[PDB]
DNA sequence: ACTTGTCGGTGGTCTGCTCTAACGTCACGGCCAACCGATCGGA
DNA sequence: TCCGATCGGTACCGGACATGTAAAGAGCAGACCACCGACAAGT
């Protein structure tokens, strides 16, 4: 359920003075802070713990560990290289530094809150402290700059990751039962889950289909197909008349003509002739640079 | 052990709740072993001692 | 009133008028009703079968 | 108490999971044989580097090269008649 | 194009049936029948053809005795016998009873008609 | 229970609901609801309307509310949940066999636990599991997560 | 204070999941170190 | 004389029940992500 | 009166199919079967 963001800010180690000196340019933040009805840091952290995990008796360190596990740890939160790059570009943070971390940080959260309040007020610019100025505007989720392409390699990599996670669970289970001084690498590693996951992907996944072999063109088009359906994607029923449209960003990246005319209209398409794929999964197209 | 019928408890509106004048949350607590309910009380004995 | 209809329910005009006629003669005070407009889904789900 | 209790708890859990886990019940004395065959198959797969044939399992399990086929055929689990066939939800097995 | 009549033409008089509800299978690869859906039933009801609809529902899909009796009558040349009770209705009644619902068919007198014919 | 033991009785589970239904008086409740609806007004009147609807529904028919609590679970004939042998030796099931097996397993375990004399925590947990298994059998997904 | 009231409210939560309820019930009671087992 | 039924035994396989003593003590793997209208239980 | 939350619904035909793991091991007993003895009574 909803909770005022001042509670979340105070739980992150901030005080009333910090919030006042940080969000002193706005009015809605001040109104929210005046109506928080919760002073200090421990009280807000306890309220967040009670709301998030009902039925569990709270203690001092449990709430902090829960917050760190949820947002600021690699174990249970992973803003991938694509996500990290997108957040850095959108909020103007860590400009120049290599993409090494892949987790959310308090700087990102406070920048998001500041961006939201300045967007609501009407400002068209924002510079995060220790950051680069970026324009303030809403995002279109159907834009081809916001839609990426998971190729065959990325899907196989995800399946391998699932298999390795299962194997790691089995290894950790076996580590505490066997006797030390006799444990060897080959007596702990059960390779069966990895190959099982790969086989399950290649034989059950919707994105692994039989090749069309009516003619060479059928196979050539089949290999160059972009599908919006599958695990982690849309369904042909829960998709309105918003994603089945020719966005003006498809020029040179997705063909606006070739698509099925049945119930899958707009959810399946083909790559353009000159289109390429970014390392991040975005689709690039070539242009000739002109000057004067 | 007796078991309630799911249709007549987890329905909108609940029919057991209407019949017994009990909130659906109270029924869920009772029939799923989370709270005790007083089936009957000897008021005559209490009013004398 | 003195009819078997539960208050607040929707009843057919023919049955309601027949019951009122049966109650006014050799009986007591009849029931009062007000016409209702119903959607197609509700009217089809309010059938007698 | 944590040693004797551990022994008895593990025994009870293992025996119950041997009994109450298959639609077509298999006796415990054969579930043990199936598990042993699976473990030997995993070890042979690790050692050889390829998938072990029934011949290797016969030698490493001191059983006939025919009982292994029966054991593998007793391990099949029935599929469900209600599983979906097509992409949408209109077809069933 | 790859849409040839040789792969489209299909016809059947009698073939395999299903298990739970004794209805014909579907598909050319299984020698199945053609579905007479709810819209076709509406069309028949609007036409006023009660007997065609009744025979389509009873003696071509579900009436287990009726199917063999109709085939014998056609072969020997007699009249088509009267339809019986579809098996799907009995399956529905059993499925309702398994939900602790007391569904019973009442005759004109007020007694209960047993569905254990045979 | 310790102090004022012989002054009341409290229960827990479907047995409590069964006893409450046994002590329930349909006629008096219906008369009180009618008095409220002909006297009271406001938000009480709507609740009285709905409660009177249900109570008069139970009063008009010759049945009893006791049918809402089960002491026996019917089992469908086998041919409507077939165990067929597909070609190649593979078998098939109807997904009702699994639910019936779960119900039977939990019922037998409850019988054993009651016969042994286990502490009330284990017996209560087993009874809750039996209730959940029956609910999943009748309607899998209405309460909790689907099996 | 506030912590005790939060604990009391947490222990009285519905906790519709059965596993969570059983875990709470088993966590109600304490353990035995070395000698209480022999006495029992 | 041959057969035959009751008695008794050896050896083998499939199936089920019981027991094993350092110490060990409060579950996860994971979305959900449409979108409309109706309605009961809260605030 | 406003308020989130659960629950109901979303055209037709044609066709298309079957899952990926297990910490084991022993000692003791009843049952059914495949091989056999006697043994007097019946053929």
UniProtKB/Swiss-Prot annotation, chain A:
Effect caused by changing residue 212 to Y: Rifampicin (Rif) resistant; RbpA no longer rescues transcription in the presence of Rif. Decreased affinity for Rif, no change in affinity for RbpA
Annotated phenotype, changing residue 225 to L/P: Rifampicin (Rif) resistant
Consequence of substituting residue 222 to D/L/P/R/Y: Rifampicin (Rif) resistant
Effect of residue 227 to L/P/W: Rifampicin (Rif) resistant; RbpA no longer rescues transcription in the presence of Rif, decreased affinity for Rif, no change in affinity for RbpA; tested in the Leu mutation
Function: DNA-dependent RNA polymerase catalyzes the transcription of DNA into RNA using the four ribonucleoside triphosphates as substrates. This subunit often mutates to generate rifampicin (Rif) resistance. Interaction with RbpA partially restores Rif-inhibited transcription; once the subunit is Rif-resistant however RbpA no longer stimulates transcription.
Misc remark: Mutations in the RRDR sequence (residues 423-449) confer rifampicin (Rif) resistance. Rif blocks transcription initiation but not elongation.
Similarity comment text for this entry: Belongs to the RNA polymerase beta chain family.
Subunit and partners: The RNAP catalytic core consists of 2 alpha, 1 beta, 1 beta' and 1 omega subunit. When a sigma factor is associated with the core the holoenzyme is formed, which can initiate transcription. Interacts with RbpA, which partially restores Rif-inhibited transcription.
Protein name per UniProt: DNA-directed RNA polymerase subunit beta
Native source species: Mycolicibacterium smegmatis (strain ATCC 700084 / mc(2)155)
Protein's gene: rpoB
Covered range of the whole protein: 221 to 512 of 1169
From Swiss-Prot, chain B:
Organism domain of life: Bacteria
Functional description taken from the UniProt entry: DNA-dependent RNA polymerase catalyzes the transcription of DNA into RNA using the four ribonucleoside triphosphates as substrates.
Complex formation: The RNAP catalytic core consists of 2 alpha, 1 beta, 1 beta' and 1 omega subunit. When a sigma factor is associated with the core the holoenzyme is formed, which can initiate transcription.
Family recorded in the similarity comment: Belongs to the RNA polymerase beta' chain family.
Name of the protein this chain belongs to: DNA-directed RNA polymerase subunit beta'
Source organism per UniProt: Mycolicibacterium smegmatis (strain ATCC 700084 / mc(2)155) (Mycobacterium smegmatis)
Source organism phylogeny: Bacteria, Bacillati, Actinomycetota, Actinomycetes, Mycobacteriales
């Amino acid at each position: 359920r909803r909770q005022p963001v001042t509670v979340l800010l105070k739980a992150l180690g901030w005080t009333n003075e910090q919030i006042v000196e940080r969000f002193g340019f706005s009015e809605i933040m001040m109104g929210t802070l005046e109506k928080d009805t919760t002073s200090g840091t421990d009280e807000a952290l306890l309220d967040i713990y009670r709301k998030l995990r009902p039925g569990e008796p709270p203690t001092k360190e449990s709430a902090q560990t829960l917050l760190e596990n949820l947002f600021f740890k690699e174990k249970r939160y992973d803003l991938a290289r694509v996500g990290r790059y997108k957040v850095n570009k959108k909020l103007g943070l860590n400009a120049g530094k290599p993409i090494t971390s892949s987790t959310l940080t308090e700087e990102d959260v406070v920048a998001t809150i500041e961006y939201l309040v300045r967007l609501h007020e009407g400002q068209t610019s924002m510079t995060v402290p220790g950051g680069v100025e970026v324009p303030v505007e809403v995002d279109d989720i159907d834009h081809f700059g916001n839609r990426r392409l998971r190729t065959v390699g990325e899907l196989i990599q995800n399946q391998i990751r699932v298999g390795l996670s299962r194997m790691e669970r089995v290894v950790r289970e076996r580590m505490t039962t066997q006797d030390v001084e006799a444990i060897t690498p080959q007596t702990l590693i059960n390779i069966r889950p990895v190959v099982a996951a790969i086989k399950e992907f290649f034989g059950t996944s919707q994105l692994s289909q039989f090749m069309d072999q009516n003619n060479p063109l059928s196979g050539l088009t089949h290999k160059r197909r972009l599908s919006a359906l599958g695990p982690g994607g849309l369904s042909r029923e829960r998709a309105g008349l918003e994603v089945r449209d020719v966005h003006p960003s498809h020029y040179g990246r997705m063909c606006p003509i070739e698509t099925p005319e049945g119930p899958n209209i707009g959810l399946i398409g083909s790559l353009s002739v000159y289109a390429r794929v970014n390392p991040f999964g975005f689709i690039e197209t070539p242009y000739r640079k002109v000057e004067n | 052990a007796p078991v309630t019928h799911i249709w007549y408890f987890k329905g909108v509106p609940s029919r057991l709740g209407y019949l017994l004048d009990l909130a659906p949350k109270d029924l869920e607590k009772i029939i799923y072993f989370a709270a005790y309910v007083i089936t009957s009380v000897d008021d005559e004995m209490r009013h004398n001692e | 009133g003195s009819t078997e209809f539960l208050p607040g329910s929707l009843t057919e005009r023919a049955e309601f008028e027949a019951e009122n006629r049966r109650v006014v003669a050799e009986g007591g005070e009849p029931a009062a009703g007000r016409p209702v407009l119903m959607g197609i889904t509700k009217a089809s789900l309010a059938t007698d079968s | 108490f944590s040693t004797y209790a551990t022994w008895w708890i593990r025994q009870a859990i293992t025996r119950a999971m041997a009994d109450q886990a298959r639609t077509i019940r298999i006796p415990v004395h054969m579930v043990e044989v199936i598990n042993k065959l699976g473990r030997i198959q995993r070890e042979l797969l690790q050692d050889l580097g390829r998938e072990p044939t029934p011949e290797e399992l016969a030698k490493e399990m001191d059983i006939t090269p025919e009982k292994v086929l029966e054991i593998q055929q007793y391990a099949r689990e029935p599929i469900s008649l209600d599983q979906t066939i097509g992409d949408e939800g209109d077809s069933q097995l | 194009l790859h849409h040839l009549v040789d792969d489209k033409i299909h016809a059947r008089s009698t073939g395999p049936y299903s298990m739970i509800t004794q209805q014909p299978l579907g598909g050319k690869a299984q020698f199945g029948g053609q579905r007479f859906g709810e819209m076709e039933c509406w069309a028949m009801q609007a036409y006023g053809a009660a007997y065609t609809l009744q025979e389509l529902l009873t003696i071509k899909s579900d009436d287990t005795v009726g199917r063999v009796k109709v085939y014998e009558a056609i072969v020997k040349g007699e009249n088509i016998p009267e339809p019986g009770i579809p098996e799907s209705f009995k399956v529905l009644l059993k499925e309702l009873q398994s939900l602790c619902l007391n569904v019973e068919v009442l005759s004109s007198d007020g007694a209960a008609i047993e569905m254990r014919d045979g | 229970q310790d102090r004022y033991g012989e002054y009341f009785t409290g229960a827990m589970g479907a047995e409590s609901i069964k006893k409450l239904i046994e002590n329930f008086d349909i006629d008096a409740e219906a008369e009180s609801l009618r008095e409220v609806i002909r006297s009271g007004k406001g938000q009480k009147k709507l609740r009285a309307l709905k409660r009177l609807k249900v109570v008069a529904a139970f009063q008009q028919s010759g049945n009893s509310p006791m049918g809402m609590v089960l002491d026996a679970v019917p089992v469908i004939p086998p041919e409507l949940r077939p165990m067929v042998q597909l070609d190649g030796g593979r078998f098939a099931t109807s997904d009702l066999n699994d639910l019936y097996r779960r119900v039977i397993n939990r019922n037998n375990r409850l019988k054993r636990l009651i016969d042994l004399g286990a502490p009330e925590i284990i017996v209560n947990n087993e009874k809750r599991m039996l209730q959940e298994s029956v609910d999943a059998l009748f309607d899998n997904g209405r309460r909790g997560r689907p099996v | 204070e506030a912590l005790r009231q939060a604990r009391k409210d947490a222990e009285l939560t519905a906790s519709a999941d059965s596993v969570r309820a059983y875990l709470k019930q088993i966590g109600k009671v304490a353990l035995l170190n070395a000698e209480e087992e022999v006495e029992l």
